[PDB]
Amino acid sequence: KAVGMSNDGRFLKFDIEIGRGSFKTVYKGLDTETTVEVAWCELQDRKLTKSERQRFKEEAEMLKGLQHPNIVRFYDSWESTVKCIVLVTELMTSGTLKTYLKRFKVMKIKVLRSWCRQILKGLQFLHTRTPPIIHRDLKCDNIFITGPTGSVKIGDLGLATLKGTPEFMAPEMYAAAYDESVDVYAFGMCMLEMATSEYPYSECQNAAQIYRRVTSGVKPASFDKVAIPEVKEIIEGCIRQNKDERYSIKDLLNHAFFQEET
Numbered sequence: 001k002a003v004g005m006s007n008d009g010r011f012l013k014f015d016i017e018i019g020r021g022s023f024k025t026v027y028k029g030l031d032t033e034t035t036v037e038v039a040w041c042e043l044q045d046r047k048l049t050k051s052e053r054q055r056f057k058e059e060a061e062m063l064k065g066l067q068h069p070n071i072v073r074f075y076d077s078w079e080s081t082v083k084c085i086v087l088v089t090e091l092m093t094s095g096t097l098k099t100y101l102k103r104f105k106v107m108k109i110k111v112l113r114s115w116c117r118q119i120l121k122g123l124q125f126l127h128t129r130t131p132p133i134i135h136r137d138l139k140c141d142n143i144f145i146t147g148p149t150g151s152v153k154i155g156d157l158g159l160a161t162l163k164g165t166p167e168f169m170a171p172e173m174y175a176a177a178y179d180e181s182v183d184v185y186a187f188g189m190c191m192l193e194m195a196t197s198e199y200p201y202s203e204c205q206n207a208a209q210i211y212r213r214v215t216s217g218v219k220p221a222s223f224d225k226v227a228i229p230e231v232k233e234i235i236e237g238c239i240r241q242n243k244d245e246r247y248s249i250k251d252l253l254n255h256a257f258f259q260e261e262t
């Protein structure tokens with residue numbers, strides 16, 4: 001029985017917590033138009049500058065237009081008062097990929113191959129939009145498994161973005177202009193985590209140690225533990241220091257490893 005409702009009446013909320021984050025709580029809900037169960041997410045209240053809420057309002061209109069089989073569906077968003085912002089997405093039945101990896105040690109390469117191809121197809125959708133969407137937070141916790149066939153979808157786009165010149169600019173300003181290639185780097189880290197069932201840069205104690213590492217040529221210790229050389233070679237071409245030397249997503253999907261269907 002419902003404890004909350006959308007203004008249009010389409011979406012119902014049930015008081016059954018299915019996920020928990022530090023600034024967001026995920027409840028089970030229902031789409032009464034399609035009679036499918038949905039995910040009802042309550043996010044912590046945020047500042048209401050007039051220009052910001054017109055931006056959120058219009059960014060959510062774009063998000064609910066993004067229909068693709070390897071992206072978690074965004075249905076609606078509106079403001080409410082449980083004490084906040086309410087978000088309704090597609091319900092992922094089999095949890096996150098990190099949950100699968102936390103349960104087993106050696107993923108089989110048919111699954112490595114199938115699940116990564118879907119992640120790439122989903123990233124390729126985002127990067128060919130107008131303007132393109134850069135996810136910026138691709139990780140195994142933001143990748144979900146759902147349905148009877150075990151379909152793989154990318155979710156949680158909360159940190160994504162769209163798309164004179166200063167004379168005396170500091171080096172951080174010059175390298176600050178990044179592009180979709182940061183998602184290729186992140187994909188390579190996810191594939192590394194799938195092929196090793198180890199967290200990359202586990203040995204480190206902070207993110208400061210992590211940066212100085214990639215820069216001198218020290219890849220995660222888990223990289224030199226990758227069994228299949230074809231997978232290893234895909235990973236290094238994904239996490240290359242210089243972005244202009246990396247795979248594009250299209251070349252990844254043209255790779256012999258992903259052209260196989262097994």
Ligand SMILES: CNc1nc(-c2ccc3c(c2)CCN3C(=O)c2ccccc2OCc2ccc(Cl)cc2)cs1
Pocket residue numbers: 043056059060063066071072073074077087089133154155156157158159160161162
């Ligand atoms: C597509 N499918 C899926 N989308 C999500 C998803 C999307 C948004 C949000 C969350 C999850 C949780 C946090 N969040 C928002 O605060 C937020 C809410 C509404 C509008 C913008 C927001 O953020 C700013 C922003 C700006 C540009 C882009 Cl491109 C994206 C987001 C899950 S499945």
Ligand SMILES: Nc1ncnc2c1ncn2[C@@H]1O[C@H](COP(=O)(O)OP(=O)(O)NP(=O)(O)O)[C@@H](O)[C@H]1O
Pocket residue numbers: 018019020021022023024026039072089090091092093095096141142155156
């Ligand atoms: N659409 C969804 N469908 C099903 N479960 C979801 C969905 N979104 C989130 N969850 C659950 O919520 C958890 C994910 O955590 P999340 O909502 O990202 O909070 P968070 O910890 O603040 N963000 P992060 O630490 O970056 O993962 C998992 O246990 C998921 O099962």
Ligand SMILES: [Ca+2]
Pocket residue numbers: 202203204205
């Ligand atoms: Ca550690």
Ligand SMILES: [Mn+2]
Pocket residue numbers: 141142156
């Ligand atoms: Mn998340």
